[PDB]
A paper describes a structure:
LmrR is a transcriptional repressor regulating the expression of the multidrug ABC transporter LmrCD. In the apo state, LmrR shows high affinity for the promotor region of LmrRCD. This affinity is reduced upon binding of a drug at its drug-binding site, enabling expression of the multidrug transporter. LmrR is a homodimeric protein with the drug binding site at the dimer interface.19 Central in this binding site are two Trp residues, W96 and W96′ (residue 96 from the other monomer), oriented face-to-face at 7 Å from each other.
To investigate the importance of π–π interactions for drug binding, the electron density in the π electron cloud of W96 was modulated by progressive fluorination of the W96 indole side chain. To assess whether the Trp analogs influence the overall structure of LmrR and its drug-binding pocket, crystal structures were determined of LmrR with bound Dau for LmrR variants 5FW, 5,6diFW, and 5,6,7triFW. The crystal structures belong to the same crystal form (space group C2 with very similar unit cell dimensions) and were refined to resolutions varying between 2.55 and 2.15 Å. Although the crystal structures show generally good geometry, they all suffer from high crystallographic B-factors (average B-factors for protein atoms varying between ∼57 and ∼89 Å2), indicative of static disorder in the crystals. Nevertheless, the electron density maps were of sufficient quality to identify the Trp analogs at positions 67 and 96 in both polypeptide chains of the dimeric LmrR variants. No major differences were observed in the backbone and side chain conformations around residues W67 and W96, compared to wild-type LmrR.19 Moreover, as shown in Figures 2 and S6, the binding mode of Dau to LmrR is not substantially affected by the presence of the fluorinated Trp analogs. Dau is bound in the same way as in the wild-type protein, with the aromatic part of Dau sandwiched between two Trp analog residues, stabilized by π–π stacking interactions. Thus, we conclude that the different Dau binding affinities observed for the LmrR variants are not related to conformational changes of the protein or significantly altered ligand binding modes. The binding affinities of LmrR for Dau and RBF decreased upon increasing degrees of fluorination of W96. Dau behaved less extreme, with the kd decreasing 6-fold.
Author numbering:
A (entry chain B): 3 to 67, 77 to 112
B (entry chain A): 5 to 69, 73 to 112
């Protein structure tokens, strides 16, 4: 099985991409994710509330009438993160190439 | 963010060891070149990371041979976790792709 700290990191990435598709409520998020995962990924409510309280605390999402939305801070951090993980991709690719030669 | 810098640092170090056993100085140099100078890791960061990885059985060390250097290696458990990790992260990418596609339809 996969490490747990890495399982949460994966779940955070997925929830944020859902909100990126559009504002959403918990039921819609778990439903959309289950379908998008061909049934394989069943998120529990309390895991989302645990995760959503933290993202709200960090200003990454906000709520309203209960819908959740990706803030402008959230959109910005998703770009930096995606670019950072891109630099990593190249570092690893450089390591492979340098190994061969 | 620090937790993302360290998570990334772990992934890079683990992939170095995937490429082959190596010693700390060689690892920092290889990463420095691979990042085109962007990532210069210090000795003490690797020692911090290698203590936790070795404790969890993800790497081990041994003495290689003029002069002697302490080499580190990815255990068979470590190779397996990298397989599991790479596969899970791959499915995540597919789930997200599905979320956009499913969105329109
Ligand atoms: C939208 O990208 C992200 C946004 C936020 C966090 C993340 C990521 C991310 O994509 C990401 C990864 O893709 C990977 C990891 C990761 O934790 C994140 C994020 O946290 C971990 C990983 O390196 C392993 C082996 O554990 C596997 C995977 O890398 C992929 C691609 C690499 N080039 C390499 O092939 C690796 C083995 O698999």
């Amino acid at each position: 099985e996969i490490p747990k700290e890495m399982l949460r990191a994966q779940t955070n990435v997925i929830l944020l991409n859902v909100l990126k598709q559009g504002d959403n409520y918990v039921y819609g998020i778990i439903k959309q994710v289950k379908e998008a995962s061909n049934g394989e990924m069943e998120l529990n409510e309390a895991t989302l509330y645990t995760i959503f309280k933290r993202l709200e605390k960090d200003g990454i999402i906000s709520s309203y009438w209960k819908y959740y939305r990706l803030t402008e801070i959230g959109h910005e951090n998703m770009r930096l993160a995606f670019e950072s993980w891109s630099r990593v991709d190249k570092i690893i690719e450089n390591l492979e190439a340098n190994k061969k030669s």
